[PDB]
Design an enzyme around this catalytic site. Structure first.
Site, mmCIF file in Angstrom:
data_model
loop_
_atom_site.group_PDB
_atom_site.id
_atom_site.type_symbol
_atom_site.label_atom_id
_atom_site.label_comp_id
_atom_site.label_asym_id
_atom_site.label_seq_id
_atom_site.Cartn_x
_atom_site.Cartn_y
_atom_site.Cartn_z
ATOM 1 N N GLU A 188 -21.060 19.400 74.282
ATOM 2 C CA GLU A 188 -20.547 18.975 72.966
ATOM 3 C C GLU A 188 -19.828 20.097 72.209
ATOM 4 O O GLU A 188 -18.716 19.824 71.764
ATOM 5 C CB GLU A 188 -21.637 18.331 72.096
ATOM 6 C CG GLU A 188 -22.080 16.978 72.619
ATOM 7 C CD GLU A 188 -23.466 16.503 72.209
ATOM 8 O OE1 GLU A 188 -24.022 17.047 71.234
ATOM 9 O OE2 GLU A 188 -23.985 15.570 72.858
ATOM 10 N N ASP A 195 -23.251 22.236 64.301
ATOM 11 C CA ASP A 195 -23.289 20.787 64.465
ATOM 12 C C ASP A 195 -24.483 20.185 63.766
ATOM 13 O O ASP A 195 -25.611 20.262 64.263
ATOM 14 C CB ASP A 195 -23.262 20.455 65.979
ATOM 15 C CG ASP A 195 -23.228 19.000 66.379
ATOM 16 O OD1 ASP A 195 -23.621 18.142 65.553
ATOM 17 O OD2 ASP A 195 -22.823 18.717 67.528
ATOM 18 N N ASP A 204 -18.375 10.629 73.293
ATOM 19 C CA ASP A 204 -19.427 11.391 72.650
ATOM 20 C C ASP A 204 -20.602 10.384 72.568
ATOM 21 O O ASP A 204 -20.532 9.419 71.813
ATOM 22 C CB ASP A 204 -18.986 11.860 71.234
ATOM 23 C CG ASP A 204 -20.116 12.468 70.385
ATOM 24 O OD1 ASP A 204 -21.219 12.752 70.946
ATOM 25 O OD2 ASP A 204 -19.891 12.702 69.199
ATOM 26 N N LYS A 208 -31.546 9.091 73.340
ATOM 27 C CA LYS A 208 -31.102 10.422 73.702
ATOM 28 C C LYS A 208 -32.243 11.469 73.634
ATOM 29 O O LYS A 208 -32.204 12.476 74.353
ATOM 30 C CB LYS A 208 -29.900 10.833 72.844
ATOM 31 C CG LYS A 208 -29.191 12.078 73.380
ATOM 32 C CD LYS A 208 -27.852 12.244 72.671
ATOM 33 C CE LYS A 208 -27.172 13.525 73.077
ATOM 34 N NZ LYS A 208 -25.927 13.722 72.296
#
Ligand SMILES: Nc1ncnc2c1nc(NCc1ccccc1Cl)n2[C@@H]1O[C@H](CO)[C@@H](O)[C@H]1O
Ligand SMILES: [Mg+2]
Length: 382
Positions: free
Chosen positions: A176, A199, A9, A71
């Site tokens: 994800e 999330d 992850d 990211k």
């Protein structure tokens, strides 16, 4: 020779690595004993590179050479409006190079270096790879890496490219929310179900609507808030105590970067404690001008300081249902991901939104995504 394939992850703020060993997933702790590693890279003036915890814990000592949130920039062009907006909030220098936002840092001895976002993410992946190799007692060459379900072609390719630079063959790029669903064994069920994945991470909020049909997944819709996460809850508590201190002593603590970071660290600890207690003490020795800080934060005060932020997580959930042509009663599974989902008010709002429906529970929300990636890595290891 794929050997033992790792499940990674690669998160915006934190990364997590797992392996499938002796019939189960094993989440691997790093050299600092942590099952999650900050996605941070620091360039010291001595020419050394620090990755993860060591990089994050040194951030206050000069903040322009500590890199994080890569990211947000990976697989994006320099002139992308999202990049042009993000760089305004980033403390390190971002320059246009080969059409992309390159990160510019000082590496020591008056040397300035430039790194593509995938080069920064490759350093985080190298650290994840070393964590796994120290555990396994063998070299790691292959991986399954997760990405947000909204990632486009260039973002998925730059993530694979980060793996290549790190010396990892990224065999699979998996979404994800799908990886979190796999962690809950939802891929190993007969029939058809609608899954809502909620999330809430350190800096991002993602909501995804998935369908599962006899082990086959489809991402029907995605939504969320790219700039909403646990760090924003900490900030609200910080602003509150900074204003309370200014009222109680007359002093503005923001001039001292060390005082602010001391408050930040203690605020993040008190917030985490409030997920299982109704009160927490914020204690700082020699906080400002040699004076100690000692204040209490109730869960009730933590909730009111963040009420607008917590309730705002509901809007994207209503949006995905509209985009999916589904109603609340059509949701068969609610999967919570991200450490911020431990907040009782967050769990309460999600439950109330779904009229008392209890979400899936039992898999550590900080590790669920790596867990699912590791399940897939297990199938590929042989
Ligand atoms: N119990 C929690 N209550 C509220 N928010 C939480 C909690 N745990 C974490 N994280 C994982 C964690 C656990 C133990 C020690 C350190 C950590 Cl980072 N969060 C928040 O989840 C985000 C990404 O970890 C961060 O904003 C973090 O502050
Ligand atoms: Mg995440």
């Amino acid at each position: 020779d794929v050997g033992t394939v790792v499940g990674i992850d690669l998160g915006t703020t934190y990364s997590c690595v797992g392996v499938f060993k002796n019939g189960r997933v094993e989440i691997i702790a790093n050299d600092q004993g942590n099952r999650i590693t900050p996605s941070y890279v620091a360039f010291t003036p001595e020419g050394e590179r620090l990755i993860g915890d060591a990089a994050k814990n040194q951030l206050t000592s000069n903040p322009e050479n500590t890199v994080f949130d890569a990211k947000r920039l990976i697989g994006r062009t320099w002139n992308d409006p999202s990049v042009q907006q993000d760089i305004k909030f980033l403390p390190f220098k971002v320059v246009e190079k080969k059409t992309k936002p390159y990160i510019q840092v000082d590496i020591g001895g008056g040397q300035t270096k430039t790194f593509a976002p995938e080069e920064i993410s490759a350093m985080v992946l190298t650290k994840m790879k070393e964590t796994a190799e120290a555990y396994l007692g063998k070299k790691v060459t292959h991986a399954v890496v997760t990405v947000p379900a909204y990632f486009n072609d260039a973002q998925r390719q730059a993530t694979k490219d980060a793996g290549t630079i790190a010396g990892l063959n990224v065999m699979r790029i998996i979404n994800e929310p799908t990886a979190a669903a796999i962690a809950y064994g939802l891929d190993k069920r007969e029939g058809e179900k609608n899954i809502l994945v909620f999330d809430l991470g350190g800096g991002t909020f993602d909501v995804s609507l998935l369908t599962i049909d006899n082990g086959v997944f489809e991402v029907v819709a995605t939504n969320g808030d790219t700039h909403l996460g646990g760090e924003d809850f900490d900030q609200r508590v910080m602003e509150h105590f900074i204003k309370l201190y200014k009222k109680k002593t007359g002093k503005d603590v923001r001039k001292d970067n060390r005082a602010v970071q001391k408050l930040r660290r203690e605020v993040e600890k008190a917030k985490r404690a409030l997920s299982s207690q109704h009160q927490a003490r914020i204690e700082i020795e020699s906080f400002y001008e040699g004076e100690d800080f000692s204040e209490t934060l109730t869960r009730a005060k933590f909730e009111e300081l963040n009420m607008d932020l917590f309730r705002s997580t509901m809007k994207p959930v209503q949006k995905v249902l509209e985009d999916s042509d589904l109603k609340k009663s059509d949701i068969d599974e609610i999967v919570l991901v991200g450490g911020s989902t431990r907040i009782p008010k967050i769990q309460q709002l999600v439950k109330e939104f779904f009229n008392g429906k209890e979400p899936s529970r039992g898999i550590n929300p900080d590790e669920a995504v790596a867990y699912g990636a590791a399940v897939q890595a297990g199938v590929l290891s042989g």
